[PDB]
Ligand binder design. Structure first.
Ligand SMILES: CC(=O)N[C@@H]1[C@@H](O[C@@H]2O[C@H](C(=O)O)[C@@H](O[C@@H]3O[C@H](CO)[C@@H](O)[C@H](O)[C@H]3NC(C)=O)[C@H](O)[C@H]2O)[C@H](O)[C@@H](CO)O[C@H]1O
Ligand SMILES: CC(=O)N[C@@H]1[C@@H](O[C@@H]2O[C@H](C(=O)O)[C@@H](O[C@@H]3O[C@H](CO)[C@@H](O)[C@H](O)[C@H]3NC(C)=O)[C@H](O)[C@H]2O)[C@H](O)[C@@H](CO)O[C@H]1O
Ligand SMILES: [Zn+2]
Ligand SMILES: [Zn+2]
Lengths: 618, 603
């Protein structure tokens, strides 16, 4: 945690008040009545959105019964409540887009229905999140509102519906818009202003506690609501400045190098929601309060590009899937905002030759913003170019590639990272995007997943990462079990780190240097060690999949998904192949039926020594 | 008439001394007393459980804003009322099922229904919401009024709260809390704070209507107060308010007890006055009770007297010739006012079926039906009643003989409730079957299509002052007589026209005796009938219908013709079938003074 306070340094409440844009004059979309401008903006989205709206003309708004909320306490079931809720929010979002597209009033009745139904609900908070209320129950309490992920998005959607359709709504019956204003005030504006203690706001934050994607996600939704619904400038400045102080906590907490250490699967709602917040803040201040030019924000956006190997494969240190992806439209908008050509070309690449269409779902801001970017994203040339080395020195992630299709990810770090695996010093090797030396990634949660016994799960253990068992001992969990002297020579493509301190006293190791050198054709892996005492033989493990063969002593071949490599290992080792049948669908959906651990074992025992391994395409 | 019977029975102070607090007046066993519920329920138990089981997966129906808006757009009420009524019925059924079973199986659905109900902005019907300040058909969260629906919804919610607060609170206490707030905001507060709801009849003046809304809404509000208001001073004030309001209704209806709207309104007019008085009695430990007042007994007995048989009822004004009643209600009302006639009549209406719990959406009637079942099941069925019933202010007269003829006749005035221009008309039934009929619920409103003359060829005119004079009934002779002359306009040029009905053991004699100012155009006399109508000879008409056979003898100066009336309106064709007839009697004769005799007998 670093006190950068970038937003507070850019403006105080007095500065803010002088630059806030009132009366929603900041809104970038045409007036609902401006049919020609909607037709130009919409392009080929028009007919698609209209057709999606037509499918909802007889949509029956779904009631959520008390028992669906109660079921969270009874069994932990979330989906019983979330499925009808999300169906409603998606319908309302789609109807908004359809009515903007067509402008004939055909969807207005259903928009009005959705809005009115939404006001009658006691709360927009998810059943799993309601237990943070005073009563600690999973059922709404009509006397109290909190804000969660769902309710903020629900609120923002309602605010946009209100903004676009207030006039046709009031023609039908002005009480609808009136109740919408009341609902948004009670469920977003007031709780946001009056309750300093919502955990995601991080006003009470201290070391040890978590700040995560909830912070920019909830702040960006609240910010939209205020900018759309709060017409008192004094009240608006106070709310906006509060949001700036809150989001500063998030910016202060993440690393300046821009690596999202949970991995790419959170990126869209972490860095991507920080982007949304900053765009919204910029729009609301006529561009005068903008961090979109800050290099750290660009690095946070570019992490999604650098970490995306290809064909759905992503770098997956820690408890993260080896499969991933992104919203190309979001990535494009983020890229353009921070002037990252790399991100803009990457977004075009991720389209996979699809034409960009409006983002549907239930996120009103991203749906509307997707309309603005489509035409430009459509013209963008697809390319996934990046430097041969990306070095995140604080997070200690290192990506290194060559022009013949090898991509190596390596890490230093410490065994108390977010979603930690005991993996200090590990590497992953991809060949033409295909994992060849892999990192197994994320399994289904069990009771053992959190707490002592986390490290009894094989996916979390150094034993099942691309690492040694020093004197036969694996790495230990803990903040102080860490890399030392981690370096990256960007020009030579050499990553090096001393992993000795990631192992417990029983490992009896003074130093162990693990280094990776990538040349134009091969990856050289070296170990260089000094032990206090030679207790037991070292073991070295590699994780892989596909078709594994052993043509001769010192040689392994791996053939997987059209790629083929040879791994040369010291002949002092006896190589065995362990089959890991994958019962857990979260794993088998990525890797198929089984993966392998290659074990390299020896009878040797010495206080010093070194190993070289070489991997090349064949 | 200022009877003010409730205000005479107590003021606010004496009421406060006899009010029963803490719901100790409730006549039903505690939810947790399984054995007492099993005894009370009897054979209702298995049936109510099965009805609950059918609702275990019932999806509570949302009412969209457009359903309320549709009332303004097109006048459509059912688009809103059908899901609303389905919800209310489900909730009432689930209550009864859970009382019946007591295993907790229906509690989750009861809780769901109650919670859903609190989330609705209003319990008022779309057709009734336009009496709010804004005059719109959509709920406005800023204001609550009370209508028929909302009062019943409120009372149901109050009973659900009363029976199931403890198991609800075990699950989550916020449900019962919100129910208490909802009933306070939608029933208790508006009732006390708004003097201007039309049905309350505070500030009534001549010309305005007080109808079934008054006792119906007051009975529902009264239940909510008795169940939900535990402050004694607040309770007394609300209950006394209800007494003043219902006095307005009691003051407005005729003391003879006839419901001029007919047997179909009876259940929610007189029947809701009964409900109110039962509830008030129960809530004051029997100390404030009008159930012993003769007028209340007469109001109850109207339902028995007006029911001819086999679904056929007397149907003056805009009312159906087919009707009936809730036997369980009739029994309870009868027992409360000590009407042996009503009790036996209720058992008769069962038609040999066993009485079961009343379902629907009226919690009070459902619960009360459970109390009376075993007793009604032991009741012996009979429909006995006097040969003559005479309602002298309403001017309705029923007369029967031992050979199965039943005649209904009326005086009145052409501005009665749901008026037909029918001053002086009659209806004849034979072994319960209509033979000279009143078409019921526009040609159906015209004297032209009632059993009446067209004087100098002119029909009756609509209006308050178009009325009978000198209406008499000789109860012993079975003679009804009235002068209908003033029900006709000036151009009818009639000084007097006496229409009289004499029923003896064998025949109905109908007479017309008239004096005209001037003979302008021939009189015409009409009769309405159905079935198989023939004309065997001059002066004779034969009517054969549903197994009955009569002859109508008429003066030979008339030429009789049969006019077919095709009934395309299903509300009429579902009663009478595809067509009915008007017999017209026409003549060339014209005289200033004359008389006609008509005789109807079975052959
Ligand atoms: C129940 C609870 O409070 N859990 C806390 C954690 O929050 C969870 O974070 C998830 C996340 O951001 O991945 C949330 O998942 C996301 O939910 C939204 C709204 O329904 C949806 O749009 C996304 O698709 C979805 N993403 C998924 C599943 O990947 C989840 O709602 C939420 O409960 C919280 O992060 C941690 C902080 O330490 O504490 C838990 O107690
Ligand atoms: C629209 C309006 O305000 N109409 C006023 C009349 O009220 C109607 O009275 C009807 C009645 O008492 O018969 C009501 O019908 C009954 O409605 C209840 C509740 O929903 C239902 O349980 C009954 O079964 C039903 N009866 C039927 C169908 O026969 C109706 O809801 C109500 O609108 C009012 O009496 C007159 C008096 O002058 O004024 C009208 O404006
Ligand atoms: Zn791992
Ligand atoms: Zn009639």
């Amino acid at each position: 945690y670093t006190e950068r306070d970038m937003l507070q340094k850019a403006a105080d409440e007095t500065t803010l008040k002088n630059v806030l844009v009132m009366k929603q004059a900041w809104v970038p979309y045409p007036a609902y009545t401006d049919r020609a401008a909607w037709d130009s903006l919409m392009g080929s989205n028009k007919q698609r959105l209209i057709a999606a709206g037509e499918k909802l003309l007889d949509y029956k708004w779904q009631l959520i019964p008390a028992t669906a909320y109660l079921e969270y306490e009874r069994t932990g079931n979330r989906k019983i409540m979330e499925v009808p809720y999300d169906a409603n929010r998606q319908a309302l979002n789609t109807l908004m887009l359809a009515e903007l597209a067509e402008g004939k009033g055909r969807f207005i009745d259903q928009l009005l229905n959705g809005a009115y139904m939404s006001c009658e609900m006691n709360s927009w908070v998810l059943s799993a999140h309601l237990p943070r209320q005073s009563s600690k129950r999973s059922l709404p309490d009509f006397r109290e509102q909190i804000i969660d992920l769902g309710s903020g998005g629900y609120g923002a959607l309602m605010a946009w519906v209100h903004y676009f359709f207030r006039k046709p709504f009031d023609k039908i019956n002005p009480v609808v818009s009136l109740q919408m204003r009341k609902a948004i005030k009670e469920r977003i504006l007031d709780p946001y202003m009056n309750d300093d203690d919502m955990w995601w706001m991080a006003f009470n934050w201290q070391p040890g506690e978590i700040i995560n994607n909830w912070n920019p996600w909830c702040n960006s939704n609240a910010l939209q609501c205020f900018l759309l619904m709060e017409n008192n400038k004094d009240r608006l400045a106070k709310a906006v400045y509060r949001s700036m102080k809150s989001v500063d906590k998030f910016i202060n907490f993440v690393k300046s190098d821009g690596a999202c250490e949970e991995g790419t699967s959170a990126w869209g709602h972490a860095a991507g929601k920080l982007y949304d917040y900053l765009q919204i803040l910029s729009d609301g201040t006529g561009g005068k309060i903008s961090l979109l030019n800050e290099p750290m924000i660009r690095r946070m956006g570019e992490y999604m590009s650098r970490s995306y190997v290809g064909n759905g494969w992503v770098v997956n240190f820690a408890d993260a899937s080896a499969q991933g992806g992104g919203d190309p439209l979001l990535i494009y908008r983020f890229g353009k905002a921070v002037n990252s050509n790399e991100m803009m070309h990457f977004a075009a690449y991720l389209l996979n030759g699809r034409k960009p269409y409006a983002t549907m779902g239930n996120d009103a801001f991203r749906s509307l913003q997707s309309l603005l970017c489509c035409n430009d994203l459509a013209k963008e040339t697809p390319k996934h170019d990046m430097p041969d080395v990306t070095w995140y020195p604080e997070t200690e992630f290192c990506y290194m590639k060559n022009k013949n299709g090898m991509f190596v990810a390596a890490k230093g770090g410490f065994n108390n990272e977010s979603h930690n695996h005991n993996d200090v010093g590990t590497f992953s090797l991809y060949v033409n995007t295909i994992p060849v030396i892999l990192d197994a990634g994320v399994g289904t949660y069990t009771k053992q997943t959190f707490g002592k016994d986390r490290y009894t799960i094989w996916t979390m253990q150094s034993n099942y990462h691309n690492l040694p068992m020093i004197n036969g001992i694996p790495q230990k969990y803990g903040q102080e079990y860490k890399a030392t002297n981690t370096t990256c020579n960007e020009k030579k493509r050499v990553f090096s780190t001393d992993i000795a301190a990631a192992y417990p006293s029983e490992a009896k190791v003074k130093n162990w240097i693990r280094s990776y050198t990538l040349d134009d054709r091969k990856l050289t892996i070296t170990d260089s060690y000094t032990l206090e005492e030679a207790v037991a033989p070292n073991q070295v493990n590699f994780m892989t999949w596909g078709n594994v063969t052993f043509p001769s002593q010192g040689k392994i071949q791996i053939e997987v998904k059209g790629q083929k490599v040879e791994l040369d290992y010291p002949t002092l080792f006896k190589a065995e192949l362990e089959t890991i049948q994958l019962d857990d669908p979260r794993l088998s959906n990525v890797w198929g039926k089984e993966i392998y651990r290659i074990t390299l074992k020896t009878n040797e025992k010495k206080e010093t020594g070194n190993y070289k391994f070489v991997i090349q395409q064949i």
